[PDB]
Amino acid sequence: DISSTEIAVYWGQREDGLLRDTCKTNNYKIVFISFLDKFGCEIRKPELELEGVCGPSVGNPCSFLESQIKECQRMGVKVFLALGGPKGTYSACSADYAKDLAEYLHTYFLSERREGPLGKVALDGIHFDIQKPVDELNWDNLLEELYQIKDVYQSTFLLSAAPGCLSPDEYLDNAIQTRHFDYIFVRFYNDRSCQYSTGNIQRIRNAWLSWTKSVYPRDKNLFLELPASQATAPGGGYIPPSALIGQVLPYLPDLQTRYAGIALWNRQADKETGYSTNIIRYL
């Protein structure tokens, strides 16, 4: 229901502040480190570069994040790695490369087996934010290889996706139809056919309904992903906090069984406007 709302947030830019400080706010239950956005056929060991934060181009190594990640997890926050994003050049390449990449993610990000870009860690999940890939092929293969690895080691990491709000999604529909994601974060912004606007919840309500019908199983596995300010959604979609709580959430069909909470793009925007602070007050 509404009171059990969990909040997620994207993190990975200079203006976001430190990861540790983001967790210690205690506003969030999930944080996406964003993004791993360059990989494809000839890139056997993908590197992480966070703009103005860490990477070979910044002169500060991303492995300094290891202790902050661990502090977050200790205080009950789940830390995901997000693939893809609005920028970069990414592709799953082929059925063979999809196996290579799934093994790479498991060895270096999910099991503490070796030292990787974020140091020696075991993250809580992998998040498919496939907004603008080279093409739509092989994303289902990547998902299915990670799912299989989970069975082999009896691991507990989670798998999630962030499709656009118009079903069926151009890039992730085959993957979503496997029924093997744990969570779906539907992006209700930058699309006039399915987002909120002042005095009209009919299009977002209908789109929520379409997603409850086409996503199985029928668990609490659906989040709304929304912009945390007007500035991070030049295509529209921003919902003021009082309108979210009062005019939108009470009127989503099957809220009781399907709704898991909200995700905010992004941490910088959230700091600037107090979005999640005002939501938490009205819970």
Author numbering: 1 to 283
Which sentences did the original study use to describe this structure?
The European XFEL (EuXFEL) in Germany is the first MHz XFEL. Our results demonstrate that MHz XFELs can be used to collect high-quality serial femtosecond crystallography data, and that under the conditions used in the current experiment, shock waves caused by the interaction between the sample jet and the XFEL pulses do not compromise the data to a measurable extent. We demonstrate here that it is possible to separate the data of the three types of protein crystals in such a microcrystalline mixture of jack bean proteins (urease, concanavalin A and B), and to determine the structures of the two concanavalins, using data collected at the first MHz XFEL. Therefore, now that the first MHz XFEL has become available, we investigated this issue at current EuXFEL operating parameters, using microcrystals of the model protein lysozyme.
As well as addressing the challenges associated with MHz data repetition rates using a model system (lysozyme protein crystals), we investigated a microcrystalline preparation of jack bean proteins precipitated with acetone, a preparation described by James Sumner, who used this technique for the first crystallization of an enzyme (urease) in 192618, resulting in a Nobel Prize in 194619. To this end, we collected SFX data of a microcrystalline mixture of jack bean proteins, crystallized using acetone as published previously. In contrast to the concanavalin A and B microcrystals, which diffracted strongly, urease microcrystals diffracted only to low resolution and with low signal-to-noise ratio, and no structure was refined. Indeed, the electron density maps are of excellent quality and the overall structures are virtually identical to those determined using macroscopic crystals, with core RMSDs on Cα atoms against reference structures of 0.31 Å for concanavalin A (vs. PDB entry 1JBC30) and 0.24 Å for concanavalin B (vs. PDB entry 1CNV31). As shown by the electron density maps of the concanavalin A and B structures determined in this study, the data are of high quality and this is likely to improve as experience with ultrafast detectors such as the AGIPD increases.
